Write an enzyme that holds these catalytic residues in place. Structure first.
Site, short mmCIF file in Angstrom:
data_model
loop_
_atom_site.label_atom_id
_atom_site.label_comp_id
_atom_site.label_asym_id
_atom_site.label_seq_id
_atom_site.Cartn_x
_atom_site.Cartn_y
_atom_site.Cartn_z
N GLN A 44 6.75 7.76 -10.51
CA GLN A 44 6.01 8.84 -9.77
C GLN A 44 6.82 9.37 -8.57
OE1 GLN A 44 2.03 6.66 -9.35
NE2 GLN A 44 1.30 8.76 -9.52
N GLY A 100 2.94 5.02 -12.59
CA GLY A 100 3.94 4.67 -11.55
C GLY A 100 4.47 3.24 -11.62
N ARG A 101 3.76 2.31 -10.96
CA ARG A 101 4.06 0.84 -11.11
C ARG A 101 4.12 0.45 -12.61
NH1 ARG A 101 -0.33 -1.18 -6.47
NH2 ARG A 101 0.27 0.43 -4.93
N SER A 102 3.21 0.96 -13.42
CA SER A 102 3.11 0.66 -14.87
C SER A 102 4.41 1.10 -15.57
CB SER A 102 1.90 1.34 -15.48
OG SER A 102 0.67 0.75 -15.07
N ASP A 108 0.85 -1.22 0.00
CA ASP A 108 0.00 0.00 0.00
C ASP A 108 0.88 1.26 0.00
OD1 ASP A 108 -2.43 -1.36 -0.10
OD2 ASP A 108 -3.20 -0.53 1.82
N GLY A 121 -1.82 4.53 -14.12
CA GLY A 121 -1.14 4.05 -15.35
C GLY A 121 0.21 4.74 -15.61
N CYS A 139 -2.02 0.33 -13.62
CA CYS A 139 -2.09 0.34 -12.14
C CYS A 139 -3.29 1.22 -11.80
CB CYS A 139 -0.75 0.78 -11.57
SG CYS A 139 -0.04 2.25 -12.39
#
Ligand SMILES: Cc1ccc(CC(=O)NC[C@@H]2CCCO2)cc1
Length: 284
Positions: A262, A220-222, A181, A218, A215
């Protein structure tokens, strides 16, 4: 400069924030006029995350062709990716329309439906074999075929049917379920294992349309997923694997979608993943 060395130099100096802001300062700025039309306000999850007009995916309908999605095309690596936001209640049908129209084989999901007590994305796929979904706005049917649940990720086989032509295709859903999280994972081991399972499937290969990656926003993680994949592919292809400059690859990818990576922690995690993955693939 070997990135492993650059890594220890930034770590010992603790300058991750300063490197990250240099990227933000040099990143491309292109117009997003379609995304900001008033008729598209309920098609956007976040007001500050829009696709550039030059690289946006267009839906094949005369009504309204708009979706919050971008085509990232990496010329030297010979890889393409679609990066999109987590679908909304009013965009579930648009999402599956795009998957159909672009001939994608795979969907990669890097978030949970609920995180931090709030909804990060809609429940856009069926949870039980015998309860299929029908998207009447786009004339598609979606059925769960099978589900393989592991400790760090779940793989699902789906059947998508174009109700107009009665054609069907198999779509693979790759769901990474354990990103925390807050912050980033401590080790990139399970993320790299996940990336190699997507590759093994054929989803990233040129005989299919581009993989769809999301994510919540779309970016950061992506962003982390496609930067690591492209960097490891370039280290395979080039004569000197040490010429691969992860900051230059990230600025090239930011020509196609804003805000990819990000935070300074996500940038550091991306370095760690590339450094570690470069080893196992060929034992370094
Ligand atoms: C957010 C969201 C919106 C829409 C849908 C489609 C849906 O579940 N439609 C109902 C019928 C019942 C059986 C066939 O589909 C899913 C998720």
């Amino acid at each position: 400069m070997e990135m492993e060395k650059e890594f220890e130099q930034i770590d010992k100096s603790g300058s991750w924030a300063a490197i990250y802001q240099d990227i933000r300062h040099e990143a491309s700025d292109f117009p997003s006029r379609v995304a900001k039309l008033p008729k598209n306000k309920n098609r956007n999850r976040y007001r500050d995350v829009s696709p550039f007009d030059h690289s946006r995916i267009k839906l094949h309908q005369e009504d309204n062709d708009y979706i919050n999605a971008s085509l990232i095309k990496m010329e030297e690596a010979q890889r393409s990716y679609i990066l999109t936001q987590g679908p909304l209640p009013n965009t579930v049908g648009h999402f599956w329309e795009m998957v159909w129209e672009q001939k994608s084989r795979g969907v990669v999901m890097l978030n949970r439906v609920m995180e931090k007590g709030s909804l990060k994305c809609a429940q856009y796929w069926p949870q039980k074999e015998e309860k299929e979904m029908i998207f009447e706005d786009t004339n598609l049917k979606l059925t769960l075929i099978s589900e393989d649940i592991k400790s760090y990720y779940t793989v699902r086989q789906l059947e998508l049917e174009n109700l107009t032509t009665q054609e069907t295709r198999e779509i693979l859903h790759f769901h990474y379920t354990t990103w925390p999280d807050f912050g980033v994972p401590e080790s990139p081991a399970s993320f790299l294992n996940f990336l190699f399972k997507v590759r093994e499937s054929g989803s990233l290969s040129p005989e299919h349309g581009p993989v769809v990656v999301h994510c919540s926003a779309g970016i950061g993680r992506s962003g982390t997923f496609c930067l690591a994949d492209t960097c490891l592919l370039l280290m395979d292809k080039r004569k000197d694997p040490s010429s691969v400059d992860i900051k230059k690859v990230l600025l090239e990818m930011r020509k196609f979608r804003m805000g990819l990576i990000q935070t300074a922690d996500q940038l550091r995690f991306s370095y760690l993943a590339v450094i570690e993955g470069a080893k196992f693939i060929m034992g370094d």
